Design a protein around this ligand. Structure first.
Ligand SMILES: Nc1nc2c(ncn2[C@@H]2O[C@H](COP(=O)(O)OP(=O)(O)OP(=O)(O)O)[C@@H](O)[C@H]2O)c(=O)[nH]1
Ligand SMILES: [Mg+2]
Lengths: 846, 82, 99, 56
C-alpha cells in the first residue's frame, strides 16, 4: 500500500501496538475555538516531513469534511494514531481524538470519552474559562478519566493585550486556580490538584509551534549550558520563589524590590524577548539574537513575512513537543493499568464478574471484546465503518464475529447478529493504514458490521463467551429538545428519504428520529447549527432529493401544581378490583436529585428511606412506602403507597404491583394533555380493593385501568405545562452590554449575571431564556451589536408555562403572538392539533 | 550520548535478559535504565551458574558488573537505528 | 436582484404553527438549510472568528508592554520545596537573552 | 375507495386540480380527509358510466 513519508517506519508502529504499556488513549477537548485542531496540525507536521502549513491559511489536517471547511468549526470528532518521542528519547504510541468544542456537538465528545482514558483540556489564555470548558470538566470527571490542562494561545498575552510579565503570570495563575476550583467542586478525590510543579499543566501557542512544561524548558537550559539536573531545576520555576544572584540559590524572600519571580525571570521574559526581536527588530538586532541563541537561518528564510518567520524561529528554538508527551505519559494511565475503572464504569454486570476480571488485565489473547461507539461514512455514502476500541482479545481480518446491539440481554437474545469483518484499518485523518489484526488496547476501524449497528455495538466471538453482556449506552451531557418535521416534496419518493433518515441516525449519536401517529417524521436536535448540519448531510449525502422542513418547535412536558380536589377511583371492566389515587407535587430539588442518580432504585430499602427522612424530612410511614419511580428507569415521578395494612392486605397487594408499575410506566410517558412526559409528580395509592381469584388479577384488565387511574389523578390536580429554559453566556465588549439587555428584553428572558473578565476588556453576560424564544437569538445579537457579541446556548432546566391549559373560555386568534396567560392554552391546543389528537380533552374523560 | 544507550532506553517496558560478571542470567521486563547501565528490572527468572531456576520480582543491577544484555528483535526498526 | 404559488397542505397548516417571533430573511441566510425549502445554490457562510483584543498605541513615550486601564483588573490572591535543600546553578549559567 | 385503491404514501394530493385564481386561504384547503372524500366521490361517479359509451 502507498503511504506518505513518515519519520518512523510503519513496521515500528505495527510492533509497538503489542505492548499495552507504551500506548496512551487521549481525548483532546475544550471550548469552541481554543486551538485543538491546530495543535493536531503541529503534531502531524512534527511526524511528517512533507506536510507543511501554507503561509496564509491554516492547515486543518484533521478537518476532512467540506462542512467543517466552509463553516470553520468542528463537526465530527476525528481520530489519529501517531508515534511521538518524549524528552528522554523514548518512542510512544498516541491515539488522539480531536473533538469539537461547540456546545451543540457535545455528543461528539461523549462518544470520544468512552473509548479513551485521559483528557487534555485546551484553554485560551486570553479568554479563560468559558461555558463548555466548565461543562466538560464535570463531564470528564464524572466519566472517571484523568484530567490534564494545556493553556493554549499565550501569545495573545504578548501580541494582542501587550501585557506586563507579572500580570500575564497572574492571569495564568488565575486560570489555573479557577480550573482547580472546578475540579474540586465535583470531585471527592483530593489528589486531583493541577499545577505546573507536578508536570500537570502545559503552556502552548498553536499558531507558532510553542509547547513547553517546566521540564522541557529546563531540558533546554541543560542542552544550552550543561551540568544542570533539569528534573530538579524544573521544580522551582513556579510560585513565589526567587533567584538570588549573589548566592546563586532559590530563596522564598525578596532580595530587592525589583526582584521578579523565577517563572518570570527564567521562562517568560526570554519568550517576550524572542517574540519582540522577531516582530519589532527583524532588521537590526535579529541576527545578533539568533547568533546568541545558536540558531542559523538561510538568507531566503530571513526574507519571509513576520508570522512564518516567527513560526520558523520558535520551531527551531523549541523543536519537538516533548512536554506534551511527558504530561500524557506521566499523568494519563496506560490501558493495562486503567482498565479496571473502565470495566467497572462501562461494563454491565460489574467488574467482579468472570469476564470482567478477564477484561481487567488487557489480555491480547483470549475472549474478543470490542466496543464500537462511532460510525464513519465512506466517500460514496453507501456503507459505514464502525470505530471503537478493543477491550480484550485480538480482532482479525476475515474473522466471523458476533455483533451485539443495545437491546441485547442474556435472557432475550434477540438484538444480535453474526457478521464477517472485511478489512481492518488504523486511522490517520486523511489516510488509513490497512492491517490484518488489531490486538487489545488499541483503536480499531472495522469494515462489514455496520448493518445492525444503530448507536453503539459490542463485538464478541461466535463460539464461547456465553455470559457476554453488552456495555452501557452513551450517557449524553444534554437533552435534545428541538423538534423539526420533514416531508419529501414528491410523495412517491418517501422510501428514498426513509433511507437517509436511518443513515444520519447512525452518524449522529444524540439524534432521535421518530414517526408520529399523524404520519409526521420528527427529528429531535440540540440547536440550530446542529440541525443545519443534519439537513446538509441528510440531503446532499443520503437523499439527493428535495425535502421540505417545517418551522421548529420545542418539546413540552406536563405537570401538576395543587393537590387534587377529589380522590380518583377507577375499576377494571371485570368490575372486581378498584384502585384509588391522590396526585401531589414533589418538593423543590428532589427531581434533580433523582435524575443525577443521587437517589437510586435496587438499594436494599435502608439508605433509600434514610435519604428521604434525613434531607427532605419524610416520615417513617412515608419513607418505607415507595413502589417504583420514573417511566424510564430513573425518571422524575414516584409511585407511592398510603394504603394502611389495617384496611388493605399488603401481602395480596404486593402481587398486583408488578402490573401496576407497568401501568404507571406506560402511563407517565404520553400523558393525557398533549402526549408528553410527566414531571415532578408523586402518584399516591390510598385505597385498593384487590381481586381474590388469580384470573381476575391479570395485567390485561388492570394496566389500562391503572393508566386511567394515573390519567384521572393527573387531570384532577390542576395540570400545567412546562417548557425548557436554555442557559446563555454572551461574550461582548463593554459598550454593547446595554444592547444585549435591549435584545433579551423582548424574548421573555432575564439576565442573572454580568461579570467582567479579569485581564480582558470583554464582559460576560449569563442569562436564562425560553427555548421557544431562542430562534434567531444569536443572529439578533450579532446583527444588533455590529457583530461584536457572541453567544452559545445549552439546555438548562424546565419551568412552568404561564397560563391555564384547560381554560376553554380562551379564544385564540390565529397568526398572532399571544400574551402571557394565553401561552399554555396555545401550546397545548396547537401541539394536540400537530400530533393528531382531538380538539380538546375534558376533566371527566377518564 | 551515543546510539546504544538510546537503544537501551528504547527497550524499557519489554522483556530483556542480562548476564553479569558472576555468570548469572536474569530474564524479565526492563523497568528503568539510565545513561550508565544501572538496570531496574522486574518479574525475573534467574539462572545461576550451576543451573538453579529462581523467581525474583524486583532486581536492581549495577551497570559495572554487567557483561551484556540481550534485547527484543523488533527494535531493528527503531528510529535511532535507521 | 431579479429572481433566479403553493396550495394548502397538512404540512403548512397555520393552525399547527406557533407564531412567537417573526422569521426574517437573515435567519434564512445564516442557516440556509433549516428555514428554507428548495436550497439549490446557497453557500455556507463563515461562522465565527475569536475577538481580536488588540489595543492601539496612542503615546510613543509609554513602554510597549504597559497595563492599559482599558483592560479590566486582575483580582489578586502550592507544593514548594524548602530552601535548605540547596540547588546551586553553575556560575556561567544565565537566563536567556539578558543583554 | 381505499379498499380497491390503497394509498400508502399519501400520493392523492399531487394531481389534484385546484383553482389558482383565488387567494390561498380563499380556495380549497387540502386536508387529507377532504381530498380522500373528493377522490371517493369522483370514483363513485366514474363507476356508473360504461367507458365504451362515455368517459369522464
Ligand atoms: N493567536 C493565536 N491564534 C491561534 C492560536 N492557535 C490557534 N489560533 C487561531 O484561532 C483560530 C481557531 O483555531 P482552531 O484550531 O481552528 O480552533 P479549534 O479549537 O479547532 O476550534 P474547534 O473547531 O472548536 O475545535 C484560527 O484562526 C487559528 O489560527 C495561537 O496559538 N495563537
Ligand atoms: Mg477545531
Amino acid at each position: 500500500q502507498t503511504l506518505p513519508v513518515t519519520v518512523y517506519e510503519m513496521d515500528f508502529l505495527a510492533d509497538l501496538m503489542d505492548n499495552s504499556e507504551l500506548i496512551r488513549n487521549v481525548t483532546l477537548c475544550g471550548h469552541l475555538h481554543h486551538g485543538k485542531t491546530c495543535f493536531v496540525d503541529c503534531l502531524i507536521e512534527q511526524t511528517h516531513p512533507e506536510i507543511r502549513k501554507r503561509y496564509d491559511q491554516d492547515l486543518c489536517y484533521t478537518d476532512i469534511l467540506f462542512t467543517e471547511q466552509e463553516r470553520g468549526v468542528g463537526i465530527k470528532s476525528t481520530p489519529v494514531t501517531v508515534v511521538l518521542p518524549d524528552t528522554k528519547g523514548k518512542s510512544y504510541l498516541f491515539n488522539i481524538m480531536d473533538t469539537p468544542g461547540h456546545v451543540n456537538f457535545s455528543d461528539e465528545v461523549t462518544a470520544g470519552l468512552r473509548i479513551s482514558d485521559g483528557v487534555v483540556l485546551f484553554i485560551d489564555a486570553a479568554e479563560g474559562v468559558m461555558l463548555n470548558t466548565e461543562r466538560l470538566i464535570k463531564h470528564a470527571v464524572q466519566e472517571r478519566l484523568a484530567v490534564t490542562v494545556c493553556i493554549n494561545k499565550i501569545d495573545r498575552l504578548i501580541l494582542e493585550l501587550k501585557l506586563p510579565p507579572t500580570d500575564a503570570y497572574y492571569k495564568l495563575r488565575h486560570i489555573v486556580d479557577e480550573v482547580n476550583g472546578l475540579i474540586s467542586m465535583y470531585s471527592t478525590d483530593e489528589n486531583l490538584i493541577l499545577s505546573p510543579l507536578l508536570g500537570n499543566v502545559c503552556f502552548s501557542s498553536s499558531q507558532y509551534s510553542i509547547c513547553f512544561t517546566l521540564g522541557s524548558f529546563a531540558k533546554i537550559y541543560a542542552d544550552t549550558f550543561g551540568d544542570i539536573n533539569y528534573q530538579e531545576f524544573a521544580k522551582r520555576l513556579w510560585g513565589d520563589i526567587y533567584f538570588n544572584p549573589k548566592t546563586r540559590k532559590f530563596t522564598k524572600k525578596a532580595p530587592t524590590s525589583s526582584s521578579q519571580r523565577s517563572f518570570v525571570e527564567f521562562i517568560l521574559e526570554p519568550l517576550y524577548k524572542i517574540l519582540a526581536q522577531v516582530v519589532g527588530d527583524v532588521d537590526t538586532s535579529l541576527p545578533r539574537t539568533l547568533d546568541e541563541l545558536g540558531i542559523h537561518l538561510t538568507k531566503e528564510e530571513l526574507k519571509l513575512n513576520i508570522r512564518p518567520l516567527l513560526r520558523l524561529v520558535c520551531k527551531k528554538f523549541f523543536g519537538e513537543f516533548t512536554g506534551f508527551v511527558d504530561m500524557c505519559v506521566q499523568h494519563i494511565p496506560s490501558p493495562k493499568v486503567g482498565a479496571k475503572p473502565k470495566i467497572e464504569h462501562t461494563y454491565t454486570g460489574g467488574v467482579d464478574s468472570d469476564l470482567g476480571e478477564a477484561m481487567s488485565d488487557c489480555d491480547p489473547d483470549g475472549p474478543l471484546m470490542c466496543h464500537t461507539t462511532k460510525m464513519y461514512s465512506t466517500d460514496d455514502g453507501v456503507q459505514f465503518h464502525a470505530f471503537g476500541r478493543v477491550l480484550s482479545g485480538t480482532i482479525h481480518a476475515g474473522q466471523p464475529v458476533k455483533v451485539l446491539g443495545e437491546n441485547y440481554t442474556l435472557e432475550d437474545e434477540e438484538d444480535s447478529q453474526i457478521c464477517t469483518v472485511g478489512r481492518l484499518w488504523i486511522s490517520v485523518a486523511r489516510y488509513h493504514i490497512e492491517v490484518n489484526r488489531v490486538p487489545a488496547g488499541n483503536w480499531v476501524l472495522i469494515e462489514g458490521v455496520d448493518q445492525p449497528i444503530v448507536k453503539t455495538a459490542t463485538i464478541t466471538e461466535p463460539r464461547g463467551n456465553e455470559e457476554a453482556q453488552i456495555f452501557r449506552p452513551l450517557k449524553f451531557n444534554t437533552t435534545s429538545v428541538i423538534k423539526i418535521a420533514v416531508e419529501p416534496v414528491n410523495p412517491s419518493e418517501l422510501p428514498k428519504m426513509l433511507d437517509g433518515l436511518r443513515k444520519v441516525n447512525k452518524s449522529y449519536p444524540s439524534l432521535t428520529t421518530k414517526v408520529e401517529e399523524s404520519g409526521e417524521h420528527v427529528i429531535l436536535g440540540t440547536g440550530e447549527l446542529y440541525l443545519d448540519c443534519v439537513m446538509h448531510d441528510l440531503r446532499k449525502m443520503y437523499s439527493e432529493i428535495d425535502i421540505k422542513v417545517a418551522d421548529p418547535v420545542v418539546t413540552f412536558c406536563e405537570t401538576v401544581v395543587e393537590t387534587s380536589s377529589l380522590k380518583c377511583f377507577a375499576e377494571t371492566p371485570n368490575k372486581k378490583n378498584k384502585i384509588t389515587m391522590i396526585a401531589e407535587p414533589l418538593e423543590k430539588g428532589l427531581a434533580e436529585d433523582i435524575e443525577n442518580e443521587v437517589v437510586q432504585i435496587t438499594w436494599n430499602r435502608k439508605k433509600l428511606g434514610e435519604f428521604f427522612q434525613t434531607k427532605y424530612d419524610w416520615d417513617l410511614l412515608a419513607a418505607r412506602s415507595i413502589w417504583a419511580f420514573g417511566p424510564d428507569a430513573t425518571g422524575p415521578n414516584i409511585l407511592v403507597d398510603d394504603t394502611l395494612p389495617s384496611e388493605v392486605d399488603k401481602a395480596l397487594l404486593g402481587s398486583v404491583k408488578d402490573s401496576i408499575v407497568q401501568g404507571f410506566q406506560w402511563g407517565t410517558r404520553e400523558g393525557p394533555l398533549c402526549d408528553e412526559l410527566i414531571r415532578n409528580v408523586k402518584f399516591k395509592i390510598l385505597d385498593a380493593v384487590v381481586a381474590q381469584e388469580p384470573l381476575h388479577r391479570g395485567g390485561g384488565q388492570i394496566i389500562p385501568t391503572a393508566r386511567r387511574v394515573v390519567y384521572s389523578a393527573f387531570l384532577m390536580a390542576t395540570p400545567r405545562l412546562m417548557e425548557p429554559y436554555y442557559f446563555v453566556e454572551v461574550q461582548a465588549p463593554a459598550d454593547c452590554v446595554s444592547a444585549v439587555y435591549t435584545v433579551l428584553a423582548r424574548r421573555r428572558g432575564h439576565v442573572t449575571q454580568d461579570a467582567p473578565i479579569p485581564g480582558s476588556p470583554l464582559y460576560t453576560i449569563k442569562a436564562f431564556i425560553p427555548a421557544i424564544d431562542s430562534f434567531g437569538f444569536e443572529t439578533d445579537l450579532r446583527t444588533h451589536t455590529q457583530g461584536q457579541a457572541f453567544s452559545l446556548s445549552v439546555f438548562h432546566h424546565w419551568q412552568i408555562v404561564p397560563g391555564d391549559p384547560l381554560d376553554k373560555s380562551i379564544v385564540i386568534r390565529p397568526l398572532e403572538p399571544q400574551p402571557a396567560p394565553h401561552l399554555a392554552r396555545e401550546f397545548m391546543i396547537k401541539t394536540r392539533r400537530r400530533k393528531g389528537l382531538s380538539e380538546d380533552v375534558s376533566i371527566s374523560k377518564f | 550520548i551515543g546510539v546504544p544507550i538510546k537503544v537501551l532506553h528504547e527497550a524499557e517496558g519489554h522483556i530483556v535478559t542480562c548476564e553479569t560478571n558472576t555468570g548469572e542470567v536474569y530474564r524479565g521486563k526492563l523497568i528503568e535504565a539510565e545513561d550508565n547501565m544501572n538496570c531496574q528490572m522486574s518479574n525475573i527468572t534467574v539462572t545461576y551458574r550451576d543451573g538453579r531456576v529462581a523467581q525474583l520480582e524486583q532486581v536492581y543491577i549495577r551497570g559495572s558488573k554487567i557483561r551484556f544484555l540481550i534485547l527484543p528483535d523488533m527494535l531493528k526498526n527503531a528510529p535511532m537505528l535507521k | 436582484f431579479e429572481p433566479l404559488d403553493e396550495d394548502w397542505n397538512e404540512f403548512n397548516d397555520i393552525n399547527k404553527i406557533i407564531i412567537r417571533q417573526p422569521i426574517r430573511t437573515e435567519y434564512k441566510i445564516a442557516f440556509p438549510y433549516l428555514y428554507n425549502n428548495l436550497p439549490h445554490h446557497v453557500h455556507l457562510t463563515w461562522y465565527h472568528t475569536p475577538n481580536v483584543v488588540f489595543i492601539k498605541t496612542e503615546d510613543p513615550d509609554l513602554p510597549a508592554f504597559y497595563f492599559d486601564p482599558l483592560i479590566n483588573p486582575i483580582s489578586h490572591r502550592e507544593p514548594l520545596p524548602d530552601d535548605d535543600e540547596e540547588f546551586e546553578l553553575p556560575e556561567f549559567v544565565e537566563p536567556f537573552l539578558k543583554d | 375507495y381505499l379498499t380497491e385503491h390503497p394509498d400508502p404514501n399519501n400520493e392523492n394530493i399531487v394531481g389534484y386540480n385546484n383553482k389558482k385564481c383565488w387567494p390561498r386561504d380563499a380556495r380549497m384547503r387540502l386536508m387529507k380527509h377532504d381530498v380522500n372524500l373528493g377522490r371517493a366521490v369522483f370514483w363513485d361517479i366514474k363507476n356508473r358510466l360504461p367507458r365504451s359509451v362515455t368517459t369522464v
